[PDB]
Coordinates of C-alpha atoms in Angstrom, one line a residue:
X1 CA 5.1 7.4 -21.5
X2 CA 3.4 4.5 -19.5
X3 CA 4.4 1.9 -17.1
X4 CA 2.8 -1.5 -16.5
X5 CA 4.3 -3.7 -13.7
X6 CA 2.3 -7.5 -11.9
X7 CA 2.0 -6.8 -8.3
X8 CA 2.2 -10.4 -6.6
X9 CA 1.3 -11.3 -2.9
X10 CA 4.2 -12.2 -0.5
X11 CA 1.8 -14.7 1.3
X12 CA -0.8 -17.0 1.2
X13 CA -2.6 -14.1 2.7
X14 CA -1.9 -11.2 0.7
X15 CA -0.1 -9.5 4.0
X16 CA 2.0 -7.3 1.1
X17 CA 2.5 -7.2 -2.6
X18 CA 5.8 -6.8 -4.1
X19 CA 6.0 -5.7 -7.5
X20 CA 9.7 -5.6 -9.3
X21 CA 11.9 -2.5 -9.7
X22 CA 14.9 -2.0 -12.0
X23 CA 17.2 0.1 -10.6
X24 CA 20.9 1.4 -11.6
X25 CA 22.6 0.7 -14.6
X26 CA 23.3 -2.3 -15.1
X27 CA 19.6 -3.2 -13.7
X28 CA 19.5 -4.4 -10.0
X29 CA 15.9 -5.9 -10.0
X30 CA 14.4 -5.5 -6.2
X31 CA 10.9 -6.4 -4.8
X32 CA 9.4 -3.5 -3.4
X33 CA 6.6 -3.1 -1.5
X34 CA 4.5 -0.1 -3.4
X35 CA 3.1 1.9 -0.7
X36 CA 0.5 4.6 -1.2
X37 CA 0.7 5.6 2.2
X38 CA 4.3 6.8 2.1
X39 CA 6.7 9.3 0.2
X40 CA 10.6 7.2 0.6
X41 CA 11.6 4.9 -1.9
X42 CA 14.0 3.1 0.0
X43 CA 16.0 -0.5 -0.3
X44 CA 18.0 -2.8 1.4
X45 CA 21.6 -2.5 0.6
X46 CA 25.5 -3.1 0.2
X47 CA 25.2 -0.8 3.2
X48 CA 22.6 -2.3 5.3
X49 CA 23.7 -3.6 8.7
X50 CA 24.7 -7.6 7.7
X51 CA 23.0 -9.0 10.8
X52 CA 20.1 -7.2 9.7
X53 CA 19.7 -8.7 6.5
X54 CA 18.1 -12.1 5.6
X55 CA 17.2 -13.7 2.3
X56 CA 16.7 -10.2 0.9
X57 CA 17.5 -8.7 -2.7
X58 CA 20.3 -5.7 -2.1
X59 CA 21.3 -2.8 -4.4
X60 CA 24.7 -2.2 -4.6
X61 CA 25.2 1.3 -5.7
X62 CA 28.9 0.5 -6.2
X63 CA 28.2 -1.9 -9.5
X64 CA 26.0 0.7 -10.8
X65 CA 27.2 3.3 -13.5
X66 CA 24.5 5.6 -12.8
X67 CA 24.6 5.7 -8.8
X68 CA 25.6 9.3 -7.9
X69 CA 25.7 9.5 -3.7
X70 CA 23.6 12.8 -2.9
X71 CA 25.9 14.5 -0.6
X72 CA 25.1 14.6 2.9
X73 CA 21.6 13.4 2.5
X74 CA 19.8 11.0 4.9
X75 CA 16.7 9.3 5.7
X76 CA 14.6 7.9 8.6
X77 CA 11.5 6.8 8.9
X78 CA 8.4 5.4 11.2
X79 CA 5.6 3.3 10.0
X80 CA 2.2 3.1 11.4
X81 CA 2.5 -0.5 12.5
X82 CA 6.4 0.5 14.4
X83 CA 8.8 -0.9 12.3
X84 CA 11.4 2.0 11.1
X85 CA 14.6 1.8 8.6
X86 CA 17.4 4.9 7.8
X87 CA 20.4 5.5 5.8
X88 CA 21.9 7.1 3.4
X89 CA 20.5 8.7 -0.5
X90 CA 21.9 7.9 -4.1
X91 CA 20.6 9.1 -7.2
X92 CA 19.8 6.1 -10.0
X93 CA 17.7 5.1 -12.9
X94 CA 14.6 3.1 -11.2
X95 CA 12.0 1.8 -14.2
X96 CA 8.7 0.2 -13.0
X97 CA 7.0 -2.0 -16.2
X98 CA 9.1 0.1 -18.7
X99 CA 8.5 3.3 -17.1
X100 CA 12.3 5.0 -16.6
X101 CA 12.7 8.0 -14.3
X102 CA 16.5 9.5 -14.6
X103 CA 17.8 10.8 -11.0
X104 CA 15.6 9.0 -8.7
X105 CA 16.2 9.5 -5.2
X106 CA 17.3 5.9 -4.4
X107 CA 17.0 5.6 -0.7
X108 CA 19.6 3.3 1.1
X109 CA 19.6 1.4 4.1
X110 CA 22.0 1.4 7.0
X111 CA 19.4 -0.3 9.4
X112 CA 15.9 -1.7 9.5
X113 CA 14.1 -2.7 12.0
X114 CA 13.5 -7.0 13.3
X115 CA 10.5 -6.9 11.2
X116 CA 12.2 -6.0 7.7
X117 CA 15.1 -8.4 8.8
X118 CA 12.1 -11.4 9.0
X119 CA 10.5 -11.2 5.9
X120 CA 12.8 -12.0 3.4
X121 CA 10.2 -11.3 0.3
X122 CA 10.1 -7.2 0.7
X123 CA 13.9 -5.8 -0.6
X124 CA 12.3 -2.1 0.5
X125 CA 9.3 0.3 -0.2
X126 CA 8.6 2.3 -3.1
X127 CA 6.1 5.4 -1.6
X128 CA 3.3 6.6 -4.2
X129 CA 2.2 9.5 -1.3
X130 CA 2.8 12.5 -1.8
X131 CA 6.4 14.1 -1.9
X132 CA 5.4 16.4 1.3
X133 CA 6.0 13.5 3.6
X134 CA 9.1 12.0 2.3
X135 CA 11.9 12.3 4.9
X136 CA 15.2 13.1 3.5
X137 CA 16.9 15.6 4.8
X138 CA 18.3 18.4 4.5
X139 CA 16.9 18.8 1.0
X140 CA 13.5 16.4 0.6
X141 CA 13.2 14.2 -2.2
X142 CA 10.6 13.4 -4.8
X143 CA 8.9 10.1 -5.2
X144 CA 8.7 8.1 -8.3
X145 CA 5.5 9.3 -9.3
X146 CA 6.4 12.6 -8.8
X147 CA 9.2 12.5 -11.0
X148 CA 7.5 10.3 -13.6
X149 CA 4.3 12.4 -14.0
X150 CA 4.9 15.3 -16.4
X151 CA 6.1 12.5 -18.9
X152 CA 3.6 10.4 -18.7
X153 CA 0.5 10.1 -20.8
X154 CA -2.1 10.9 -18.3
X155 CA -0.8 12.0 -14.8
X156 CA -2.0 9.2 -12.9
X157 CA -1.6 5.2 -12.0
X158 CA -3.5 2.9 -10.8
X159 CA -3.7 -0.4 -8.3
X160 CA -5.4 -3.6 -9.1
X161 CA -4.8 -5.5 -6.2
X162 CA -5.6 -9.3 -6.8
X163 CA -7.6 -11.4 -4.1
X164 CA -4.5 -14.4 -3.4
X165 CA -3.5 -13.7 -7.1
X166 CA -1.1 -11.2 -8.8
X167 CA -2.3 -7.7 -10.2
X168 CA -0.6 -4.7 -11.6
X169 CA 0.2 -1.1 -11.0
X170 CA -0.3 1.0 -14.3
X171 CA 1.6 4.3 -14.8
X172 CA 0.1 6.9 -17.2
X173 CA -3.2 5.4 -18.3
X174 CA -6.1 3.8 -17.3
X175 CA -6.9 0.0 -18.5
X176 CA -10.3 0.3 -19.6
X177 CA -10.6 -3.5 -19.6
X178 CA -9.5 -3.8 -16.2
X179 CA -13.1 -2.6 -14.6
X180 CA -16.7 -3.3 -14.6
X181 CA -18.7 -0.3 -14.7
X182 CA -18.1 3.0 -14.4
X183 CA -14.8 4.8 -12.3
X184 CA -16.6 7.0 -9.8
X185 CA -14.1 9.4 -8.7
X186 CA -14.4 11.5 -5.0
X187 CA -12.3 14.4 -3.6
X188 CA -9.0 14.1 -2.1
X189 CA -7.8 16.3 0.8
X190 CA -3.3 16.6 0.4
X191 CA -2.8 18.4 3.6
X192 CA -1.6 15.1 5.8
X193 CA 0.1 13.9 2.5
X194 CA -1.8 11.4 1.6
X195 CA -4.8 10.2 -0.8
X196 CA -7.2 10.9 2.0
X197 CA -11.0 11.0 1.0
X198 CA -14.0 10.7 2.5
X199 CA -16.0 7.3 1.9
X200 CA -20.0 8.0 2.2
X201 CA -21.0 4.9 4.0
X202 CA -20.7 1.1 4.4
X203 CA -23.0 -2.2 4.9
X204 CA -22.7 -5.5 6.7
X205 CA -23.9 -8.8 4.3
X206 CA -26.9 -7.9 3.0
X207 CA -28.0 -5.3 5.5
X208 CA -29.3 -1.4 4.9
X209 CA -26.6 0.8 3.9
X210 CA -25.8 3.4 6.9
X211 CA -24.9 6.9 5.2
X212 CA -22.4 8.1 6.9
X213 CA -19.0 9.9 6.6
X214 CA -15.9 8.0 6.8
X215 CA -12.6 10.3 6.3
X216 CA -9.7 8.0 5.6
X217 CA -6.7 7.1 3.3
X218 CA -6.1 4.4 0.7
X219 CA -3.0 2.6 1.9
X220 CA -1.9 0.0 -0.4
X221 CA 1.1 -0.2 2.6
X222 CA -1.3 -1.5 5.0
X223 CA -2.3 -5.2 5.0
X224 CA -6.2 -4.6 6.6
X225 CA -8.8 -2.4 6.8
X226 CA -8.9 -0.1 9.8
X227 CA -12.3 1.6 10.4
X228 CA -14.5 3.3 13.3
X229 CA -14.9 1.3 16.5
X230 CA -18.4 1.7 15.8
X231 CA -18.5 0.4 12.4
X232 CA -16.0 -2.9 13.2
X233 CA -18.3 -3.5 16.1
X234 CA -21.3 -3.9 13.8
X235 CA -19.5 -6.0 11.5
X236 CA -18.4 -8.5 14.1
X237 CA -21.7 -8.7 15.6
X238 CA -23.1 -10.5 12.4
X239 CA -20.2 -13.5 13.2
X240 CA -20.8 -15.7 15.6
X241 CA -18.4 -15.8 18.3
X242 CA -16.3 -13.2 17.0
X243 CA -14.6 -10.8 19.8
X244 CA -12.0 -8.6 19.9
X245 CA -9.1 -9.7 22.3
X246 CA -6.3 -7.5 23.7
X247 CA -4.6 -10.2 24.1
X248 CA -4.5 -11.0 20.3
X249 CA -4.8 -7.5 19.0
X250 CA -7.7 -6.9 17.5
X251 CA -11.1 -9.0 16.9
X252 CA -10.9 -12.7 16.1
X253 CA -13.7 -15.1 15.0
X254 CA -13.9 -18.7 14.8
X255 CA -12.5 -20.4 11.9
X256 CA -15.7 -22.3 11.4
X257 CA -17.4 -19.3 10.4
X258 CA -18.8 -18.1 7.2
X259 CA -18.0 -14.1 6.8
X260 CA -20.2 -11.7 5.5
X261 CA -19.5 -9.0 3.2
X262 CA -18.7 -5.5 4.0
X263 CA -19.7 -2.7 1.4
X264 CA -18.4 0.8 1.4
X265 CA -19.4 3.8 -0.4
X266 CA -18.1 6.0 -2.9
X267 CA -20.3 8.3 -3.6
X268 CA -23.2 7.1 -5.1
X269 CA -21.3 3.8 -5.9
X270 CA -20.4 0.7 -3.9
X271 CA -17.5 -1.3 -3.8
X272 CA -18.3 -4.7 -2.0
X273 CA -15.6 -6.3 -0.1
X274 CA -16.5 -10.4 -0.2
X275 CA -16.2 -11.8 3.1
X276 CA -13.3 -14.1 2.1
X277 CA -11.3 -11.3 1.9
X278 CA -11.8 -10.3 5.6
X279 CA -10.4 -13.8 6.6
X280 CA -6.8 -13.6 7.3
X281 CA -6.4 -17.0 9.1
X282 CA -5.5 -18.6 12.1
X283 CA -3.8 -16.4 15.2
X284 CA -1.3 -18.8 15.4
X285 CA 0.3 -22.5 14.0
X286 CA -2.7 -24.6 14.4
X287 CA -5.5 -22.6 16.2
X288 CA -9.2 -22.6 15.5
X289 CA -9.1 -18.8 15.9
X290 CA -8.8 -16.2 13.4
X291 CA -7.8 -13.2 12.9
X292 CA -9.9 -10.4 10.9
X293 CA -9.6 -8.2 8.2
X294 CA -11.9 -5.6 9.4
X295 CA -10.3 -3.7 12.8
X296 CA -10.4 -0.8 14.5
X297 CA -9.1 2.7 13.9
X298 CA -8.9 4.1 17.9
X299 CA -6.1 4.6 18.7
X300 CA -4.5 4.9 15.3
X301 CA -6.2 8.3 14.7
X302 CA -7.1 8.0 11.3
X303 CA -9.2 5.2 9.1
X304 CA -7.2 3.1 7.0
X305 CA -8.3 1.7 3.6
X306 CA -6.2 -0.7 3.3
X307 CA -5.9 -3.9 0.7
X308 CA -8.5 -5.7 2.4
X309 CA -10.8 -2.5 0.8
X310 CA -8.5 -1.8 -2.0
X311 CA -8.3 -4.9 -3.9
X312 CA -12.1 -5.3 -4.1
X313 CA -12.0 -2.5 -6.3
X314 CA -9.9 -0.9 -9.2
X315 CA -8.4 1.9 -8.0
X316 CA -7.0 5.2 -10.0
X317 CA -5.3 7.6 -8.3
X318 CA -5.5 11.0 -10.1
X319 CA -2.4 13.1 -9.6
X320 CA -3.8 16.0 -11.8
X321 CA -3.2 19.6 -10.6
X322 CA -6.4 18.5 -8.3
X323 CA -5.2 15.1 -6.7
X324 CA -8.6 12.9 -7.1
X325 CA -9.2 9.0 -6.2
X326 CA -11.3 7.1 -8.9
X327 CA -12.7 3.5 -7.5
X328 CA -14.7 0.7 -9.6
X329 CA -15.6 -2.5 -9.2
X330 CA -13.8 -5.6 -11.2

């Protein structure tokens, strides 16, 4: 089997993609945010607190044939950036571009936090990490890819994030058409549960490349690109009047400016990121200051590839019995 799904930006930004799920029986189509830094798939609901809910797509396990409430299970969970949501756990049919997994742990929500409530274009998350983190509980759940895999063709999908365009998320093969070059692939370390690897370097523009390791994970969930103190500071040095401001959050340049690129290595191979990409637009209504793509890691304690990185490239994540991360460039 295969699956083949557009992944569409919420924003003029790309600050999330949502990419449409079927789930129960009939279908209830939601917009979920695909997430490849966490293991829930979970959705606002029938059940989700009323004043907590604005403009969003709901399931309704009630109209669906196939719901079947897993007995005294529930969920809870943190995100890196503080928002949180919990509930309760169904079981449903959940197809993603004709891909159809039977039994799904369909994860519903009682309450979200203020910033789920306030964006009305994300109806939940579907996690592509691996199972090991999701949080049901007592008995932990598996995620879509985990149940899908033994079917599928090839044990694998892929992301093609777009630059402010839609792209997909393929299940079971890889698009051959989809890349330039080769797919260099690089080791992935499981034990913190997610597609964490270890980039060998990055360049500013045009400058040298510095070898160097970079451990991090590639988090479609995450809107930026979240990297050593060190290397953000030699970024933001090649931009005129760029800073970073507490006050803000993170480094800002002006909007006049032109951006350089920012490469990063994959083995032997580079992926560059254009500098358009690392422009995510005034800090507020109006101002001549913007906020970047490229920001630091401290404090976060671990580096983030995040779509700023990821949709420069074409990206296969290898869930063979040796989890691998292929990149190429497109």
């Amino acid at each position: 089997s295969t699956g083949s799904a557009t992944t569409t930006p919420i924003d003029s930004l790309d600050d999330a993609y949502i990419t449409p799920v079927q789930i129960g029986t009939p279908a209830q189509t939601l917009n979920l945010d695909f997430d490849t830094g966490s293991s829930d798939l979970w959705v606002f609901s029938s059940e989700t607190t009323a004043s907590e809910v604005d403009g969003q797509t709901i399931y309704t396990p009630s109209k669906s044939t196939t719901a079947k409430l897993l007995s005294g299970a529930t969920w809870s969970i943190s995100y890196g950036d503080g928002s949180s949501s919990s509930g309760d756990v169904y079981t449903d049919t959940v197809s993603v571009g004709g891909l159809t997994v039977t039994g799904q742990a369909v994860e519903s929500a009682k309450k979200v936090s203020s910033s789920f409530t306030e964006d009305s274009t994300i109806d939940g998350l579907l996690g592509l990490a691996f199972s090991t983190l999701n949080t049901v509980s007592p008995t932990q759940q598996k995620t879509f890819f985990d149940n899908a895999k033994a079917s599928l063709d090839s044990p694998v999908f892929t992301a093609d994030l777009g630059y402010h365009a839609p792209g997909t998320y393929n299940f079971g093969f890889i698009d051959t058409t989809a890349y330039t070059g080769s797919i260099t692939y690089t080791a992935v370390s499981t034990k913190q549960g997610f597609w964490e690897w270890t980039s060998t370097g990055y360049a500013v523009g045009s400058g040298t490349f510095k070898s160097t390791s970079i451990d991090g994970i590639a988090d479609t969930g995450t809107t930026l690109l979240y990297l050593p103190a060190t290397v953000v500071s030699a970024y933001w040095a090649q931009v005129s009047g760029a800073k970073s401001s507490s006050s803000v959050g993170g480094y800002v340049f002006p909007c006049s400016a032109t951006l350089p690129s920012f490469t990063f290595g994959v083995g032997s191979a580079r992926i560059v990121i254009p500098g358009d990409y690392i422009d995510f637009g005034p800090i507020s209504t109006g101002s001549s200051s913007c906020f970047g793509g490229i920001q630091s890691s401290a404090g976060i304690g671990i580096n983030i590839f995040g779509d700023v990185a990821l949709k420069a490239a074409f990206v296969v994540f290898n869930g063979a019995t040796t989890p691998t991360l292929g990149f190429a460039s497109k």
